[PDB]
Design a protein around this ligand. Sequence first.
Ligand SMILES: *CCCCCNC(=O)[C@H](C)N
Ligand SMILES: [Cl-]
Length: 437
Amino acid sequence: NSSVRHGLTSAQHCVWLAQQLDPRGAHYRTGSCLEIDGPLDHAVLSRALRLTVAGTETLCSRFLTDEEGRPYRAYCPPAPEGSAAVEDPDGVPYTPVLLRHIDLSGHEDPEGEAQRWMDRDRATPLPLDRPGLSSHALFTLGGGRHLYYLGVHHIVIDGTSMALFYERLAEVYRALRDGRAVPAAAFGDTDRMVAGEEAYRASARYERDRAYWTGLFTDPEPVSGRALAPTVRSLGLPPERTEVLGRAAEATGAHWARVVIAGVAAFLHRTTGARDVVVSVPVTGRYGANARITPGMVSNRLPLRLAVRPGESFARVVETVSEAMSGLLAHSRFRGEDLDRELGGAVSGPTVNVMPYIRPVDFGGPVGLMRSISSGPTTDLNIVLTGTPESGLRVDFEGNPQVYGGQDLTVLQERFVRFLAELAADPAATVDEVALL
Ligand SMILES: *CCCCCNC(=O)[C@H](C)N
Ligand SMILES: [Cl-]
């Protein structure tokens, strides 16, 4: 139904408000891609995309305002497959669906050229009142290799949902190629997920969480302006370099993402001398079965306050992270932006985003591996990891361009990785004694 006014999630309200401060800006454009190791049929994949979008409410939506100016979400189905119509018979715009095909096979540096293309696209503003807030391109790179680019407005798609989209696209593609019925879209309902958030705000737990978070930061100013689209520098680490993180996880008993967060806390402590370190951690903000399967934007960012005292081993820092994360998860439903609103002023540190495992995407032979292009805007620094210690990592340092140049990030990144690796190689060692020239 086209006249129904859908409620925004908390995260979507937050993005909406931020967008109004810079109406024509592109700072909330984000993107990812799949590096695909075998040939795909663009014509079939284009059909697959239309069908994928048609069953993904968030990729069919536009944002409008009531008379008070308050936003709501409106659903705009695409036109039927084959149809060229732009509006339905009642004047409701159809969500356009376009899969660009960019053949770079005869190019000197297909990869580099595709990256420059994605960066140009990420700098393109998408007005929120026009349905279909995404941008798609299939690159042909020669040798039967492809790149699928998914560019979005952050208000419609979070990191979790990117994986949901890629899984669904491939599933649809496989069916179309096999000539099977396309399996039914098994996505959840955004309205129910929003209703869940509303129930939480109305519940006692909200006040408990509020007390908890205000309690922890009643007193600290963030240490290194507006949030801007980052300059992104990316570093590939093969398994030979990353396996050590897995060994550190095994030995400390902590998940490897915690080892990385401990690593960042250690790095900040050594770089700046502060014992009161803060890093921000994204959580998915998805609670319950329906929410876990609803493409959309519900992610939350929460500050992690970590005491790093002199003489401590790296294993002790991992425990500090563990202790702090336990509190954060137990009160995870409280919105980071509401915590900031309460405290006033500017609380945050570098975002440390260790993305969860995503199985390689299967197109029926060809296999797609996901990599981040830009995860979101930043006042300072996002650290984004994709991969696993066993399979290798991609490490992205995403820096506010007023704060960092590309070269600053490369140097920072290289120093951090070498420091993390040596910490991980011996968690018993005192952090302060670990040589970092
Ligand atoms: C005001 C909206 C919430 C913050 C936006 N979230 C992100 O940028 C995530 C970390 N990619
Ligand atoms: Cl996200």
